[PDB]
Amino acid sequence: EDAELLVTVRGGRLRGIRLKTPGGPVSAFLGIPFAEPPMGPRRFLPPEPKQPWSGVVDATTFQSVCYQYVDTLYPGFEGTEMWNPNRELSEDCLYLNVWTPYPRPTSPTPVLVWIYGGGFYSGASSLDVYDGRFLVQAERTVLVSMNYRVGAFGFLALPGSREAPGNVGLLDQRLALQWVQENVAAFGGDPTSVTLFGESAGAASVGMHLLSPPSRGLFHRAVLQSGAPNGPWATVGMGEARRRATQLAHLVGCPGGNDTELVACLRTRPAQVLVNHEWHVLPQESVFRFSFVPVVDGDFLSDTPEALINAGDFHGLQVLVGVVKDEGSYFLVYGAPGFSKDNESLISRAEFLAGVRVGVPQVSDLAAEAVVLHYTDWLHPEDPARLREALSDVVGDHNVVCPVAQLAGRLAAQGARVYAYVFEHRASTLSWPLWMGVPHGYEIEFIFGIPLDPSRNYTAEEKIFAQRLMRYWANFARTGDPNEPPKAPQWPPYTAGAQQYVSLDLRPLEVRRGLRAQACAFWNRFLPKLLSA
Amino acid sequence: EDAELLVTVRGGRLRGIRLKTPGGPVSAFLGIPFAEPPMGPRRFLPPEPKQPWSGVVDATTFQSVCYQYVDTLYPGFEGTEMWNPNRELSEDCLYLNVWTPYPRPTSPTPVLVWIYGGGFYSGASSLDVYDGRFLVQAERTVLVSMNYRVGAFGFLALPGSREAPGNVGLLDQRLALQWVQENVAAFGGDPTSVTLFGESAGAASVGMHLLSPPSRGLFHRAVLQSGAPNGPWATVGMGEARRRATQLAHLVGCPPGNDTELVACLRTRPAQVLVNHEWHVLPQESVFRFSFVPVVDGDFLSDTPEALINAGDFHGLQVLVGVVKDEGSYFLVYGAPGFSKDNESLISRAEFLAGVRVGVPQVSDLAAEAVVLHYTDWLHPEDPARLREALSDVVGDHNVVCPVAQLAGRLAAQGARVYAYVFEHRASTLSWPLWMGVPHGYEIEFIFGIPLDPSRNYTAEEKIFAQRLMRYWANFARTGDPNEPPKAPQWPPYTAGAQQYVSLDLRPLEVRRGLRAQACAFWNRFLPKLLSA
Numbered sequence A: 001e002d003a004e005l006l007v008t009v010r011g012g013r014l015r016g017i018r019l020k021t022p023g024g025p026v027s028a029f030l031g032i033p034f035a036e037p038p039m040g041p042r043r044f045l046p047p048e049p050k051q052p053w054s055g056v057v058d059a060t061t062f063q064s065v066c067y068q069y070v071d072t073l074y075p076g077f078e079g080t081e082m083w084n085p086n087r088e089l090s091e092d093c094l095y096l097n098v099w100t101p102y103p104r105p106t107s108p109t110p111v112l113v114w115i116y117g118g119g120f121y122s123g124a125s126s127l128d129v130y131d132g133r134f135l136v137q138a139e140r141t142v143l144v145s146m147n148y149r150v151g152a153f154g155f156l157a158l159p160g161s162r163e164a165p166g167n168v169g170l171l172d173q174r175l176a177l178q179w180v181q182e183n184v185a186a187f188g189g190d191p192t193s194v195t196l197f198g199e200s201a202g203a204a205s206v207g208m209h210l211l212s213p214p215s216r217g218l219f220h221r222a223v224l225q226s227g228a229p230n231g232p233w234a235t236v237g238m239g240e241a242r243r244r245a246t247q248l249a250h251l252v253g254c255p256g257g258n259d260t261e262l263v264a265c266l267r268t269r270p271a272q273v274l275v276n277h278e279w280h281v282l283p284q285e286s287v288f289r290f291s292f293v294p295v296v297d298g299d300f301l302s303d304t305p306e307a308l309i310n311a312g313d314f315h316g317l318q319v320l321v322g323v324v325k326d327e328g329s330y331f332l333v334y335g336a337p338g339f340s341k342d343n344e345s346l347i348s349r350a351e352f353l354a355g356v357r358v359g360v361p362q363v364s365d366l367a368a369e370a371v372v373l374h375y376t377d378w379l380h381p382e383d384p385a386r387l388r389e390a391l392s393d394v395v396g397d398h399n400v401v402c403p404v405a406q407l408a409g410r411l412a413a414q415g416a417r418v419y420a421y422v423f424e425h426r427a428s429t430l431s432w433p434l435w436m437g438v439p440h441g442y443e444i445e446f447i448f449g450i451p452l453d454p455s456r457n458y459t460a461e462e463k464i465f466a467q468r469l470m471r472y473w474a475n476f477a478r479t480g481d482p483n484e485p486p487k488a489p490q491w492p493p494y495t496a497g498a499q500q501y502v503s504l505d506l507r508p509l510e511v512r513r514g515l516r517a518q519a520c521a522f523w524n525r526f527l528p529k530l531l532s533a
Numbered sequence B: 001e002d003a004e005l006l007v008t009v010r011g012g013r014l015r016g017i018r019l020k021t022p023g024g025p026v027s028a029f030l031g032i033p034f035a036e037p038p039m040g041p042r043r044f045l046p047p048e049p050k051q052p053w054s055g056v057v058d059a060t061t062f063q064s065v066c067y068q069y070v071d072t073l074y075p076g077f078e079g080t081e082m083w084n085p086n087r088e089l090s091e092d093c094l095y096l097n098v099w100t101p102y103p104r105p106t107s108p109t110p111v112l113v114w115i116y117g118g119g120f121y122s123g124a125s126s127l128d129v130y131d132g133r134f135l136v137q138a139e140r141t142v143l144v145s146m147n148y149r150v151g152a153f154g155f156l157a158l159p160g161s162r163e164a165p166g167n168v169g170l171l172d173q174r175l176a177l178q179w180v181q182e183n184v185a186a187f188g189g190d191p192t193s194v195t196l197f198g199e200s201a202g203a204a205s206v207g208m209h210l211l212s213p214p215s216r217g218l219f220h221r222a223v224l225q226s227g228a229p230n231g232p233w234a235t236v237g238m239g240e241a242r243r244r245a246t247q248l249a250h251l252v253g254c255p256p257g258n259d260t261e262l263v264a265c266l267r268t269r270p271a272q273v274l275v276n277h278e279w280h281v282l283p284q285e286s287v288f289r290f291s292f293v294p295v296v297d298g299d300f301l302s303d304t305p306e307a308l309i310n311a312g313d314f315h316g317l318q319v320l321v322g323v324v325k326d327e328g329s330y331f332l333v334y335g336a337p338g339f340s341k342d343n344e345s346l347i348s349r350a351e352f353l354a355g356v357r358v359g360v361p362q363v364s365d366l367a368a369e370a371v372v373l374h375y376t377d378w379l380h381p382e383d384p385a386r387l388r389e390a391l392s393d394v395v396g397d398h399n400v401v402c403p404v405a406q407l408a409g410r411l412a413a414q415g416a417r418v419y420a421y422v423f424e425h426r427a428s429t430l431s432w433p434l435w436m437g438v439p440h441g442y443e444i445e446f447i448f449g450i451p452l453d454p455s456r457n458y459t460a461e462e463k464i465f466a467q468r469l470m471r472y473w474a475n476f477a478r479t480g481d482p483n484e485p486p487k488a489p490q491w492p493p494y495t496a497g498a499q500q501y502v503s504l505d506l507r508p509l510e511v512r513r514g515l516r517a518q519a520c521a522f523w524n525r526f527l528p529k530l531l532s533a
């Protein structure tokens, strides 16, 4: 036996594997059960802690992907397939992964915990782009990632009911974090130095743990990549959550009490059957909108993320936030008229106006007119190229940039130390068209150091870039400050006034002001006032 | 006696006076009565044609100025005194003036008709800045200017009543235009080539004559200087007009039941006491708002000016329209918090926000916040300089630039040939502070060729500038095209798409696009929608 690959956690005995990396060996414990399988009667229920086991559990490979919709928009296309499940689909999916240096650290080392994105309807910790072996070897930290239930299985909610209270996917995340607190020391990790980081729904998830007191004690620092809990897609109201749940039940033939009977009938439905009707419960044709997301019910979230952010005391907290250069482009091909990866998507004025109602769904005609006014260049109101970028800006600002900027601003103003970035490098291996620029989710591979993989064909500069980004992230994990303890350009904190952030690209850091200040003033300050009247 | 200074019009015989000009003599006949004195029982009533007289009317000096408020903000200050009455006040004020070449033309010459501005509460044809002697000598045209009733005497309205129907000041102008048709040929003028031109309220008057069929056949071309009939200050609702008329009666000790009794009591009051209470009938503290203005009652204007503009077929119309570089600055010192001509007026954001409610009166809080959104640089939200210029822009865009832009765009799109300018020269003699830039109304002196007066201290290049401006204006009056017909840079027509206009200053013509297109999209396209819901 190899003693380095043997670890005892509270649950019992584990056996891991020795992974080869370009920089040396790392220990990996993949597919550690942290909850009882949420199958049968446990579907829609909060996760129960994994009961003790005798003997040795082989934590030697990634476990199943939580059942989810599989993207079919561009079959065979690398840009899309990379996000699809690389393991079999199963409701038995509550497992987490631990990467640690080989040999195991003798002194407590900082812990990085990854929460994948996927719009709360998809994603998995097993995706190649989330391979934590490179971070751990390069920066000498411990990395943890977990699976959490998505779609209806994770976020279907009939609020008030105990058979499906909602937010159980977030509770999956919380249980994993508690597991880290109790067990990461056995791998040489420091439970007093834990940094959460996520992207898309993962970033929104990270933010919700910040705003929920039982979660807040389980970590110390946070990184939010291209996402925020206060995004117009990240949460849903109780009434709308209930409406979507009953609509899904109705679509699959469903049909104690009313809620108990309805969930009981839902539990008899095959997992794939639920998935097949998932998208049909959205109130209108839209982009960047997901059926089953965290619900604001007074429990996990005592109030809306907006209210909690504005009323929060964030002294003693360091956060790292940021966006990619083109947050809106990716989702445009999923329904905006005239958009495709296969053409330049040079849309008309009429397609632009129609795209606005899709990109900004469920708002008044007045609100839509306000969007058009702000994003129209009235000296060139019908230029196809400008209209394409404008709609990208609309979707990107509305869903990502301005929610992130709002969070960054309020957190900084209320005690937190904040660092902000804009990721502006377009990967040489990117398979999406040029007009999409740097799309959402494409900074991740550099943060995880994927270009260091010899099997892949990134440039030497990109490998340098990846190493620099891993350094920033790890420095922040260790000290709450991405800067290194000296002749390089510095990363100034983000404040509500100066609004300074840095550009992340092959070039050295460049300090800039304002996260689309003019645009986000519309979304964060004016538009809410308009929606109230 | 000189036969050139003797003219017989329909009402009888006139005696004129020879005037001196640096380029030779001109003939002038000042203080020609065109209406019966609107005094006593004729106050508030439409003008009646001047009854024929025996003997010779002395037309060698300007007649009385119509009763009006006299500005006392900066006593002795040239910047304000130049606009104050320079003859005695009287209700017996309905006289007009004709300037002709000396000797009187023996063939039909194009006629220019000036309508003074003054916000409908002030102004006079006798002001030095409106001296027509230079235009008429240099460009060999016949210039006519008339006095019209202002304030309550011109525009007090009890809609539906015959004792005070409103818009009689506009009817004064129309009667003068009818007088021109019947008599201008006796001076050598061509009644088939009459060009209306005015500034501020004068421009708004010109626009209203454009939109009123009985006035439309009295002239052929129009020039609108820094004003439009669709400006938020240029017209008033029937209900609000009645309220203001009623409030004035109360303030001067008149009964409010009958409209008849109310007006009869008003007629007993000296002219000065009506003037003394004029400003106090405004609904709130404000800037660029005037108590008694034209009323939309279905008679003179059968609909709102904007509605008439949108429904109109304007083929066969040529209009010359334009603005000064800083339309907002002048008014700011008349009640906007923190503003004065004697200091730099570097206001705080608190004063800016307060100034917005003053500059955009009688709108909902939501409308106000929308203004604040658009005119705030959210990277520099509290910069005193930027805030001063921003509020100037608010007042200027809202009251002048955007109403003019809307007028220009709709006319051009519906058949009219439009020429647009922005006047960007600050006179060397300007007594207003430098921060005010090129204020409203200070292009007039250049158009009237006042710099050619040797006794004034304009530069040599300013004289040449004045001469070029007079040529543009006279070219337009003659041909409907300001362009010299020409290797010099051409002045292109304004269109709704290209939105081309020229800059007027010491430098040659420069063609630019957009009359503040971004800002005016807010005022003209979005804000009306917001007020509706």
Ligand SMILES: *[P@](C)(=O)OC1CCCCC1
Pocket (backbone or CB within 6 Å): A083, A117, A118, A119, A120, A199, A200, A201, A202, A440, A441
């Ligand atoms: P988000 C709204 O979940 O979408 C992106 C998240 C990162 C991975 C690509 C999709």
Ligand SMILES: *[P@](C)(=O)OC1CCCCC1
Pocket (backbone or CB within 6 Å): B083, B117, B118, B119, B120, B199, B200, B201, B440, B441
């Ligand atoms: P208008 C809006 O009546 O303003 C006048 C103020 C005096 C100078 C001419 C324009």
